[PDB]
Design a protein around this nucleic acid. Structure first.
Ligand SMILES: [Mg+2]
Ligand SMILES: [Mg+2]
Ligand SMILES: [Mg+2]
Ligand SMILES: [Mg+2]
Ligand SMILES: [Mg+2]
Ligand SMILES: [Mg+2]
Ligand SMILES: [Mg+2]
Ligand SMILES: [Mg+2]
Lengths: 287, 110, 95, 140, 49
RNA sequence: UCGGAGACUCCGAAUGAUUAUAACCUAGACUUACAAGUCAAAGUAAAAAUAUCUAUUGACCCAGAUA
RNA sequence: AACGAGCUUGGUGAUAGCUGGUUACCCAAAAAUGAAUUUAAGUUCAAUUUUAAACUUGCUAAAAAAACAAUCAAAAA
């Protein structure tokens, strides 16, 4: 270009000609001149000038401000609280629009992370992704999304457009493998079973209205219809829809990945899957 | 980053619209980000200096400044204060005009 | 304050703060009123009402606590059902 | 299709059908959305409005339609179509839910007889005094 | 010619293919170099960095 | 240490009596290094609105108590 | 060869709110009042000061009228 044309005329670029970007660096002030020498910015003789003033929060000897306020349990149990990285429907639709999520295939935490739709940190107590009601109106997509937590209104958007929404619990060990599958296969260890939710979460994931994976299949129809009446839409017939098998697809409660059973081993180098023939191990894994 | 899939009807429900075809004939071209979005960002410094910056500008940046100055002057009632970073190829505008500029750039087809 | 710890070489959080104050992601700090559990039999009803409340911190106090706590205590926490969900952001503030 | 001990088939043997969950209930109970006309207007947030003609509201029982009209005649438009709107959220779904529910309440309150009105509030008490004062005033 | 897809608006740069085999074999072919590699904006701070 | 009076000289206090018993919640303010201490509409709730003067202080930690 | 408790090495670069010192030029702006503190040879906060940024009224003056030469302050300039 025109700017590129100027470079042609100018002398050859070399190691001598190198220059830092304007104002990128600062002058480092040293103590050798009158303004910055002598007392060297430390004032007169005293404790702060000897370099030995007290610690932070020390207010001269009176009871400090931070120690004189009652202890309260704002942050108690913080390290064991459950975190769900929320997902809104604007982000979901936006991701589907740009081809970073495949709506035709079933959706799960692995395919959200693969398309960089969501960022998950298992080490920071993340237990999955919670769907959020923001963006329901703009949502006009039919997709089978699995998310650990769901909401009433978020369910309506998925169902109204003719989609399947399910909620499943992944324990801390299961979640790490789900977000990051490949390395687990590199470790060489067999795939583990997925533990059931602890007592606190048992009511939620067994509840029909929450679309829990362990919930009774028979009660789903009624729960969907009641929600359909509430939000003023007519239930679509998924069975008639051509992709009924895909939408209806649901992984086993003890499965981390749809198509892989617990106890198998994946050999990427040889492009093979190894399954144990031992009866004892099969008993344990089948459980 | 997958190339966005072709859609029958634009804009998509989210709001995304691909670059217009044929390309604009203006001297300056504003390229899209690797995520296929218009490179217009709200920025802030010191906690109260609100600015909006166009980043992937190409060609004669000066023409873009003149066009933006005319576009934003009637709304504010004054010529906006702007900086042109020729080396970085960016245009900086005081205040937040992300929504207005995004649509304005969309019409031109950049 | 431990500015550089021997084993790791990092700054150390003061746990006297973690057990008294709550930080909202915007930068505000919450605290209780000293004495809200003390000698309630001689305090007036209006006096007791004030004590039960949660109070904010000043710019100086907020600046101090930010020096005595590490970045881990300044992150975003996505707790489901959090009763402080709405208070982590500032809205309609021009300043 | 790997099936664990906790597979939904074993847990709920009766409902082993693959399409049992994904089938649509028979129903036949209910607000006919097709009969109603729903228009969403953004007043920078949504506002829902439902306008269904009472005369053409065959789904509503005819005797109750008479009672609902007069009781809430103010909400009835000049054309005779009940007009009800709500604006309390940014999501048209939740705003629409309010519109539909008010119809159900109106039908339920009309169908049911509130035998006990019990006492009145200060506002009604003042109105009653005003009416009584007027009646005595019109001696002629 | 470029194996990858050049942006439509950009025009590929070109170079004179040469052969070291002969003293006078200065030019034997033509090449098309991807603009986003061989025509990026001139910035000497990155070279400095 | 606190407060009353005088313009430093005097008086009191770590409050008692009277109390047919005095809720919750919440705009705006006083005072003030911080901490503490003051007044209060609206809304709501008991009942058929303010306890009565004179004035009255003690943080955090940590131990006690109860359903 | 200076014992109110030997000397040598090590801990040890003991610690010192105390005394002393702290190395080129140039331009510019620039103050010992209130509170608490085993506090008054110290430190922390307020107030002041300063570098940057945001946007809009600020200083002197300020009639009448209040509360009584001040506390307050409206058009103006
Ligand atoms: Mg240095
Ligand atoms: Mg002391
Ligand atoms: Mg995260
Ligand atoms: Mg205070
Ligand atoms: Mg009131
Ligand atoms: Mg002074
Ligand atoms: Mg002392
Ligand atoms: Mg001292």
């Amino acid at each position: 270009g025109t700017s590129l044309d100027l470079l042609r005329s100018l002398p050859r670029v070399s190691l001598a000609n190198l220059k830092p970007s304007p104002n990128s660096r600062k002058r480092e002030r040293r103590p050798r001149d009158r303004r910055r020498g002598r007392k060297c910015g430390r004032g007169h003789k005293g404790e702060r000038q000897r370099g030995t003033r007290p610690r932070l929060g020390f207010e001269g000897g009176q009871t400090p401000f931070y120690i004189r306020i009652p202890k309260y349990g704002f942050n108690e149990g913080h390290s064991f609280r459950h975190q769900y990285q929320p997902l809104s429907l604007r982000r979901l639709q936006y991701l589907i629009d740009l081809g970073r999520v495949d709506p035709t295939q079933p959706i799960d935490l692995t395919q959200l992370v693969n398309g960089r739709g969501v960022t998950i940190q298992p080490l920071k107590r993340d237990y999955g992704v919670q769907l959020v009601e923001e963006g329901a109106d703009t949502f006009q997509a039919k997709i089978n999304i699995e998310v650990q937590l769901a909401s009433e209104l978020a369910i309506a958007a998925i169902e109204k457009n003719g989609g399947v929404v399910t909620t499943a619990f992944y324990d801390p060990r299961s979640l790490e493998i789900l977000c990051k599958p490949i390395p687990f296969f590199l470790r060489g260890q067999p795939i583990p079973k997925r533990m059931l939710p602890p007592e606190s979460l048992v009511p939620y994931y067994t509840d029909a209205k929450n679309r829990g994976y362990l919930a009774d299949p028979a009660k789903f129809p009624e729960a969907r219809l009641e929600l359909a009446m509430k939000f003023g839409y007519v239930l679509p017939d998924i069975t008639k829809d051509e992709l009924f098998r895909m939408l209806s697809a649901r992984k086993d409660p003890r499965q981390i990945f749809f198509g892989l059973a617990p106890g198998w081993v994946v050999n990427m180098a040889d492009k093979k899957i190894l399954k144990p023939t031992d009866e004892n191990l099969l008993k344990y894994y089948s459980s | 980053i997958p190339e966005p899939p072709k859609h029958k009807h634009y804009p998509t429900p989210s709001g995304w619209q691909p670059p217009r075809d044929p390309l604009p004939s203006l001297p300056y071209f504003v390229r899209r980000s690797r995520m296929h979005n218009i490179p217009v960002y709200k920025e802030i410094t010191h906690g109260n200096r609100q600015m909006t910056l166009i980043r992937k500008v190409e060609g004669d940046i000066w023409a873009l400044q003149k066009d933006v100055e005319e576009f934003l002057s009637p709304l504010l009632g004054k010529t906006p204060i702007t900086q042109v970073n020729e080396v970085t190829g960016t245009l900086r505008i005081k205040g937040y005009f992300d929504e207005q500029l995004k649509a304005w750039l969309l019409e031109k087809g950049f | 304050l431990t500015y550089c710890s021997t084993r790791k070489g990092k700054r150390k959080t003061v746990k006297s703060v973690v057990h008294r104050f709550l930080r909202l992601h915007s930068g505000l700090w919450l605290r209780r009123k000293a004495g809200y559990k003390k000698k309630l039999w001689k305090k007036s009803t209006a006096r007791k009402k004030r004590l039960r409340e949660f109070v904010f911190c000043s710019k100086t106090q907020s600046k101090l606590l930010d020096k005595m706590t590490t970045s881990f205590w300044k992150r975003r926490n996505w707790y489901a059902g959090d009763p402080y969900q709405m208070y982590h952001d500032r809205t309609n503030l021009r300043v | 299709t790997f099936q664990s001990i906790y597979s939904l088939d074993k847990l709920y043997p009766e409902s082993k059908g693959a399409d049992t969950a994904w089938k649509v209930p028979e129903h036949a109970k209910y607000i006919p959305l097709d009969r109603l006309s729903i228009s969403y207007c953004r007043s920078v947030n949504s506002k829902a409005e439902v306008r269904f003609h009472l005369a053409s509201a065959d789904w509503i029982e005819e005797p109750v339609r008479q009672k609902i009209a007069l009781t809430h005649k103010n909400k009835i438009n000049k054309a005779g179509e009940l007009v009800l709107t709500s604006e309390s959220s940014r999501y048209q779904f939740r705003n629409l839910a309010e519109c539909l529910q008010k119809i159900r309440d109106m039908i339920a309150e009309a169908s049911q007889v509130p035998k006990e009105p019990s006492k009145e509030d200060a506002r009604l008490q003042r109105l009653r005094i005003e009416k009584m004062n007027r009646e005595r005033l019109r001696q002629k | 010619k470029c194996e990858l897809r050049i942006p439509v608006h950009r025009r590929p740069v070109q170079a004179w293919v040469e052969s070291l085999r002969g003293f006078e074999q200065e030019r034997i072919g033509l090449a098309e170099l991807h603009p986003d590699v061989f025509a990026t904006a001139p910035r000497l701070d990155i070279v400095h960095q």
